[PDB]
Every structure is written in C-alpha cells, then in structure tokens.
Amino acid sequence: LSNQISGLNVATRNANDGISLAQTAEGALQQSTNILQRIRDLALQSAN
C-alpha cells in the first residue's frame, strides 16, 4: 500500500506537470490562431 500511494503521488505530480505543459502548448496554439486570423484579415484587405 505504501509503494502504491507513493507511486500514485509521484504520478499525480507528473500529471500536473503535464497539464501545465499542455496549457503552455494551448496558449501558444491560441496565439497561432490569432496570428492566422490577422493573416486572413490583411489578406482579404489585400483585395483592394
């Protein structure tokens, strides 16, 4: 039981670090969506 709870705690910690990593990835992807939105903005403005 002690081995189980210790491995469980370290696994929950690793899962928390993974959640944070994926959160940074999601933020970067949202920034990419904003950049592509601005790209389409200037592209359709380039119809002129």
Next chain:
Amino acid sequence: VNTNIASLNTQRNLNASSNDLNTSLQRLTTGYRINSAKDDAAGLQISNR
C-alpha cells in the same frame, strides 16, 4: 496556494482592454477610425494618397 495567485490572467485581460480603450479613445478624439498611427497600413496609404 499562497506564494502566487493564478488570477494574473485577469491582469492580462485588463491590460489588453486598457490598450483597446486607449485606441478607441484616440479614434474618437481624432474622429478617425484608422489613426494616423500604424493601424491599417494599406488604408493608411489610401488615405495619404
């Protein structure tokens, strides 16, 4: 959770909204939707020409 608070997303949002508010303030005080500033460089060329 005491060494830091994750509420700084609200700080980011208030910063962005203050930028938007200053831009709209400029737009209304000069009467120009596109400012004499950087915004809409193509529209800026059209306006200068």
